Structure formats: C-alpha cells, structure tokens
Design a protein around this ligand. Structure first.
Ligand SMILES: [Zn+2]
Lengths: 166, 174
C-alpha cells in the first residue's frame, strides 16, 4: 500500500553515482516530501563523500550535509531529507545488519524515513535493480515498498532527445 | 584548426537545468544560470553534470548582473569530493537565446575553468525545432564573439538504462 515516487533526476543521480563508485558502496541523501502515510515523493538526491568507515551512520558528514543543504536552499531546493540511498555493487538490494542500524538512526530522526538500495552492476538496459525499505514497527526487521516514477510532461519531452530520431 | 569540434550533453544535465528553472519558479523574461561539469580536454567536450547558481540581473540594464563567486567555489569544492573526474568546464542558462551580457558573464567563468569556458544554453521551454541545446565557446574575430558548436545528446550506460526506464510507459503507448 506504500509507494516511493522517484523523480527523473533522483533516479539518474542514484544510477550515476552508484556506477561511478564501483567497486565500492556509495551513499547519499534523498530529498523530498512525505505526502501522506502511504506516499513519499523523492524529488532529488545528493551524494555523500566516500568515507574510510564504509557505509554507516559514521559516513554521514554533518558538515558536508549542512553546507550542501544550505546551498540547495539558496537555489530553490528546500525539501526535507526523506531518507537515504546506498549501492550494493553486484550483490542485490537488501539491508545488511549495519544497514538496518543506519536506517534505525534515520528512523529515530524521522519515523517516516526510507532506505533505497540500488545495484549498479546488475542494473542493465531493461532492468533497473532497485528497492525501497522501511523497518517493521519471531518478526522480520524490515519490508519493501512499491517504487514508481513521476515525470512531468516537460520532463518527458526532455528525456526523448536521447535517441531523438527513434 | 585545433578548435573544439562538438559537444555531447547527458540527459541528466537537461533535466537538472529544467528542474532548476522550475523549482525557482523562474518567470519570463528571466532566466536561470548555473555551472556545467564534465570533460573538455579533447575536441569533443562532454557535459555530464551541473549545479544551479544564485544569479540576479537588472531588467532595465543588461550591464548589471551578479554572480555569487563564493557559491561557485564552495559548491565546486563539494563536487570535487564526490567525483574529481567531473571538472568545472563552463556554465549554462535557460535562454532561450544568447543575451547581451553573456560574453561578459563568460569572462567571469574563465577564472574558474581550465578550458576556454563552454556556454550551454538549455531551452527549458523546449520550443525549438531540434535539440533544446545550443553550445558556444568565445573566440576572437578583432573582437570577442561566440562560436556555435554542434551538440548531441548522449548517455553512459547507467543513464541510458535510467532514461529507458523512465520512458517505458510512453514507449508502450506509442
Ligand atoms: Zn547495505
């Protein structure tokens, strides 16, 4: 019943960033709007720098984040952090125990937070390998949300310039 | 001639310029302005990323405009921490056409680029016949003028996958 709507630039940035990071895991923050209890809009993302610690709460550089968030405000992007994304190069979309810990930190800041996971190796033409998770409130610890993509008419026309003849 | 021959632009840049224009609620006759990133070290300049800039200009006077120099330096420094391969190679604006102040604005970006800066106009209104992009580098002729360079839209595999995924429902219909 829950759905994460991912925008065009958000999806392209996450695929781009994941591929650029290979063979390492990368991570960043997702920006957007909690529309209602069953709906999260992800309108944009930004990359966090690689950290020696690997992907965890420690990787979140609060000085980088604050600077990036302030500068995005100045150019018209003042959306809430609605969660985080990270890459799993070659090994699919799920949360490890450390990922669950990271997500728990995000959930404590905002209980609506979403964890997106993308696989830049297994993502191929015709197959984007991505999933979105939240923690559950013998039970399993987390579950998967539907993902959909939102694009404007202007964005649709813009995307069609790739292979414009076709 | 040793001049750049052409320019390729990633779909992300087109969508980023449009998102910038929209999110700032830019209203005609005004334009949005930002930085482009990529690689300009060959005869093909590859434009692969971008970021928005705070920018203001005087309607009553083409000679009056302001760009935030500190914003350029501070954002670029964060961009470098994410991916040093994507260099600062020029600037963009939403046009749809070259404006009187552009050669002077271009002289500012010249202080930030290693290459002769590329100006990318992205026609976010998309009224043009062909590509919503026009590319220029400044050259001498004895005065400065913009040289028009041919553009194509091209994507690395990640983005190609992404774009195809985004246009899926449209493709089915058509
Ligand atoms: Zn993980």
């Amino acid at each position: 019943k829950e759905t994460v709507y991912i925008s065009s630039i958000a999806l392209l940035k996450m695929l781009k960033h994941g591929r650029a990071g290979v063979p390492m895991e990368v991570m960043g923050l997702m920006l957007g709007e909690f529309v209602d209890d069953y709906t999260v809009n992800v309108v944009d993302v930004f990359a966090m720098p690689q950290s020696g610690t690997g992907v965890s709460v420690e990787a979140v550089d609060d000085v980088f984040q604050a600077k990036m968030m302030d500068m995005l405000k100045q150019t018209g992007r003042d959306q809430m952090v609605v969660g985080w994304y990270h890459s799993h190069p070659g090994f699919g979309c799920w949360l490890s125990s450390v990922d669950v810990n990271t997500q728990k930190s995000f959930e404590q800041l905002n209980s609506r937070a979403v964890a997106v996971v993308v696989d830049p190796i297994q993502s191929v033409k015709g197959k984007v390998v991505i999933d979105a998770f939240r923690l559950i409130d013998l039970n399993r610890h987390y579950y998967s949300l539907n993902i959909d993509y939102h694009k404007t008419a202007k964005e649709t026309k813009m995307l069609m310039n790739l292979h414009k003849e076709q | 001639s040793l001049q750049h021959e052409k320019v390729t632009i990633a779909p992300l840049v087109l969508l980023s310029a449009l998102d910038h224009y929209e999110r700032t609620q830019t209203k005609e006759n005004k334009r949005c302005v930002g930085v482009i990133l990529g690689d300009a070290n060959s005869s093909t300049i590859r434009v692969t990323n971008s970021f928005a800039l705070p920018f203001e200009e005087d309607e009553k006077n083409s000679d009056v405009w302001f760009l935030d120099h500190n914003y350029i330096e501070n954002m670029n420094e964060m961009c470098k921490k994410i991916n040093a391969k994507e260099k600062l190679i020029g600037w963009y604006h939403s046009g749809p056409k070259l404006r009187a102040s552009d050669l002077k604005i271009n002289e500012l970006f010249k202080k930030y680029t290693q290459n002769n800066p590329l100006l990318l106009i992205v026609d976010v209104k998309q009224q043009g016949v062909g590509l919503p992009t026009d590319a220029y580098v400044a050259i001498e002729q004895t005065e400065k003028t913009f040289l028009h360079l041919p553009c194509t839209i091209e994507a690395e595999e990640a983005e190609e996958i992404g774009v195809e995924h985004l246009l899926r429902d449209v493709l089915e219909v058509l």
